[PDB]
PDB file of all heavy atoms in Angstrom:
ATOM      1  N   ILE B  77      62.127 -51.270  52.675  1.00  0.00           N
ATOM      2  CA  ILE B  77      61.587 -50.162  51.893  1.00  0.00           C
ATOM      3  C   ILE B  77      62.709 -49.248  51.420  1.00  0.00           C
ATOM      4  O   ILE B  77      62.713 -48.789  50.273  1.00  0.00           O
ATOM      5  CB  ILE B  77      60.537 -49.391  52.712  1.00  0.00           C
ATOM      6  CG1 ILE B  77      59.291 -50.253  52.920  1.00  0.00           C
ATOM      7  CG2 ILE B  77      60.168 -48.094  52.016  1.00  0.00           C
ATOM      8  CD1 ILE B  77      58.422 -49.796  54.068  1.00  0.00           C
ATOM      9  N   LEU B  78      63.673 -48.963  52.296  1.00  0.00           N
ATOM     10  CA  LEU B  78      64.755 -48.057  51.925  1.00  0.00           C
ATOM     11  C   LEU B  78      65.583 -48.625  50.780  1.00  0.00           C
ATOM     12  O   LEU B  78      66.040 -47.881  49.906  1.00  0.00           O
ATOM     13  CB  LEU B  78      65.640 -47.771  53.137  1.00  0.00           C
ATOM     14  CG  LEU B  78      66.811 -46.813  52.906  1.00  0.00           C
ATOM     15  CD1 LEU B  78      66.346 -45.531  52.245  1.00  0.00           C
ATOM     16  CD2 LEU B  78      67.510 -46.507  54.217  1.00  0.00           C
ATOM     17  N   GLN B  79      65.794 -49.943  50.768  1.00  0.00           N
ATOM     18  CA  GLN B  79      66.536 -50.559  49.672  1.00  0.00           C
ATOM     19  C   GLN B  79      65.829 -50.332  48.344  1.00  0.00           C
ATOM     20  O   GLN B  79      66.462 -49.995  47.337  1.00  0.00           O
ATOM     21  CB  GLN B  79      66.714 -52.054  49.934  1.00  0.00           C
ATOM     22  CG  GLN B  79      67.524 -52.785  48.870  1.00  0.00           C
ATOM     23  CD  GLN B  79      67.019 -54.190  48.601  1.00  0.00           C
ATOM     24  OE1 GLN B  79      66.023 -54.627  49.177  1.00  0.00           O
ATOM     25  NE2 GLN B  79      67.706 -54.907  47.722  1.00  0.00           N
ATOM     26  N   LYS B  80      64.507 -50.516  48.320  1.00  0.00           N
ATOM     27  CA  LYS B  80      63.762 -50.325  47.081  1.00  0.00           C
ATOM     28  C   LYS B  80      63.785 -48.872  46.631  1.00  0.00           C
ATOM     29  O   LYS B  80      63.870 -48.600  45.430  1.00  0.00           O
ATOM     30  CB  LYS B  80      62.323 -50.802  47.259  1.00  0.00           C
ATOM     31  CG  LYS B  80      62.111 -52.252  46.873  1.00  0.00           C
ATOM     32  CD  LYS B  80      62.718 -53.187  47.901  1.00  0.00           C
ATOM     33  CE  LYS B  80      62.321 -54.627  47.644  1.00  0.00           C
ATOM     34  NZ  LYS B  80      63.100 -55.582  48.477  1.00  0.00           N
ATOM     35  N   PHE B  81      63.704 -47.929  47.570  1.00  0.00           N
ATOM     36  CA  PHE B  81      63.736 -46.520  47.194  1.00  0.00           C
ATOM     37  C   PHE B  81      65.080 -46.141  46.588  1.00  0.00           C
ATOM     38  O   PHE B  81      65.134 -45.413  45.591  1.00  0.00           O
ATOM     39  CB  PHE B  81      63.435 -45.643  48.407  1.00  0.00           C
ATOM     40  CG  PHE B  81      63.936 -44.238  48.272  1.00  0.00           C
ATOM     41  CD1 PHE B  81      63.360 -43.368  47.363  1.00  0.00           C
ATOM     42  CD2 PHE B  81      64.984 -43.785  49.052  1.00  0.00           C
ATOM     43  CE1 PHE B  81      63.821 -42.073  47.236  1.00  0.00           C
ATOM     44  CE2 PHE B  81      65.449 -42.490  48.930  1.00  0.00           C
ATOM     45  CZ  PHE B  81      64.866 -41.634  48.020  1.00  0.00           C
ATOM     46  N   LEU B  82      66.181 -46.614  47.177  1.00  0.00           N
ATOM     47  CA  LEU B  82      67.493 -46.320  46.612  1.00  0.00           C
ATOM     48  C   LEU B  82      67.652 -46.951  45.237  1.00  0.00           C
ATOM     49  O   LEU B  82      68.175 -46.320  44.312  1.00  0.00           O
ATOM     50  CB  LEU B  82      68.596 -46.812  47.550  1.00  0.00           C
ATOM     51  CG  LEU B  82      68.728 -46.084  48.887  1.00  0.00           C
ATOM     52  CD1 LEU B  82      69.714 -46.809  49.782  1.00  0.00           C
ATOM     53  CD2 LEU B  82      69.153 -44.641  48.681  1.00  0.00           C
ATOM     54  N   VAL B  83      67.200 -48.196  45.080  1.00  0.00           N
ATOM     55  CA  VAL B  83      67.391 -48.899  43.815  1.00  0.00           C
ATOM     56  C   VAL B  83      66.658 -48.186  42.688  1.00  0.00           C
ATOM     57  O   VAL B  83      67.206 -48.000  41.595  1.00  0.00           O
ATOM     58  CB  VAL B  83      66.935 -50.361  43.947  1.00  0.00           C
ATOM     59  CG1 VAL B  83      66.920 -51.028  42.584  1.00  0.00           C
ATOM     60  CG2 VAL B  83      67.844 -51.111  44.903  1.00  0.00           C
ATOM     61  N   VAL B  84      65.410 -47.776  42.924  1.00  0.00           N
ATOM     62  CA  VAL B  84      64.664 -47.075  41.885  1.00  0.00           C
ATOM     63  C   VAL B  84      65.322 -45.738  41.573  1.00  0.00           C
ATOM     64  O   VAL B  84      65.322 -45.285  40.423  1.00  0.00           O
ATOM     65  CB  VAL B  84      63.189 -46.910  42.298  1.00  0.00           C
ATOM     66  CG1 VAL B  84      63.055 -46.009  43.515  1.00  0.00           C
ATOM     67  CG2 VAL B  84      62.374 -46.366  41.136  1.00  0.00           C
ATOM     68  N   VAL B  85      65.889 -45.081  42.586  1.00  0.00           N
ATOM     69  CA  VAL B  85      66.614 -43.836  42.348  1.00  0.00           C
ATOM     70  C   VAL B  85      67.818 -44.092  41.451  1.00  0.00           C
ATOM     71  O   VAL B  85      68.087 -43.334  40.511  1.00  0.00           O
ATOM     72  CB  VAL B  85      67.029 -43.191  43.682  1.00  0.00           C
ATOM     73  CG1 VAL B  85      68.085 -42.123  43.453  1.00  0.00           C
ATOM     74  CG2 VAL B  85      65.817 -42.594  44.376  1.00  0.00           C
ATOM     75  N   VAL B  86      68.566 -45.160  41.731  1.00  0.00           N
ATOM     76  CA  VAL B  86      69.698 -45.506  40.878  1.00  0.00           C
ATOM     77  C   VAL B  86      69.214 -45.901  39.490  1.00  0.00           C
ATOM     78  O   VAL B  86      69.766 -45.459  38.475  1.00  0.00           O
ATOM     79  CB  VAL B  86      70.534 -46.624  41.526  1.00  0.00           C
ATOM     80  CG1 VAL B  86      71.483 -47.239  40.510  1.00  0.00           C
ATOM     81  CG2 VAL B  86      71.305 -46.084  42.720  1.00  0.00           C
ATOM     82  N   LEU B  87      68.175 -46.738  39.418  1.00  0.00           N
ATOM     83  CA  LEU B  87      67.652 -47.151  38.120  1.00  0.00           C
ATOM     84  C   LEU B  87      67.053 -45.971  37.364  1.00  0.00           C
ATOM     85  O   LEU B  87      67.260 -45.834  36.154  1.00  0.00           O
ATOM     86  CB  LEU B  87      66.611 -48.255  38.298  1.00  0.00           C
ATOM     87  CG  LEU B  87      67.170 -49.677  38.374  1.00  0.00           C
ATOM     88  CD1 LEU B  87      66.113 -50.637  38.885  1.00  0.00           C
ATOM     89  CD2 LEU B  87      67.689 -50.125  37.018  1.00  0.00           C
ATOM     90  N   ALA B  88      66.296 -45.118  38.053  1.00  0.00           N
ATOM     91  CA  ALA B  88      65.759 -43.927  37.408  1.00  0.00           C
ATOM     92  C   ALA B  88      66.860 -42.952  37.017  1.00  0.00           C
ATOM     93  O   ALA B  88      66.792 -42.346  35.943  1.00  0.00           O
ATOM     94  CB  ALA B  88      64.753 -43.236  38.329  1.00  0.00           C
ATOM     95  N   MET B  89      67.869 -42.784  37.872  1.00  0.00           N
ATOM     96  CA  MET B  89      68.970 -41.879  37.557  1.00  0.00           C
ATOM     97  C   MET B  89      69.823 -42.427  36.419  1.00  0.00           C
ATOM     98  O   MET B  89      70.135 -41.709  35.463  1.00  0.00           O
ATOM     99  CB  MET B  89      69.821 -41.648  38.807  1.00  0.00           C
ATOM    100  CG  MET B  89      70.989 -40.690  38.614  1.00  0.00           C
ATOM    101  SD  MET B  89      72.326 -40.990  39.787  1.00  0.00           S
ATOM    102  CE  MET B  89      71.877 -39.867  41.108  1.00  0.00           C
ATOM    103  N   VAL B  90      70.207 -43.700  36.502  1.00  0.00           N
ATOM    104  CA  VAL B  90      71.114 -44.293  35.527  1.00  0.00           C
ATOM    105  C   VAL B  90      70.446 -44.316  34.160  1.00  0.00           C
ATOM    106  O   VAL B  90      71.090 -44.046  33.142  1.00  0.00           O
ATOM    107  CB  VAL B  90      71.552 -45.709  35.948  1.00  0.00           C
ATOM    108  CG1 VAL B  90      70.387 -46.677  35.881  1.00  0.00           C
ATOM    109  CG2 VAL B  90      72.697 -46.190  35.074  1.00  0.00           C
TER     110      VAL B  90
END
Side-chain angles (χ1 to χ4, degrees):
Chain B
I77 291 160
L78 181 51
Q79 182 216 2
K80 268 73 171 169
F81 158 69
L82 292 172
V83 171
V84 65
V85 165
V86 165
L87 274 166
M89 181 205 268
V90 68

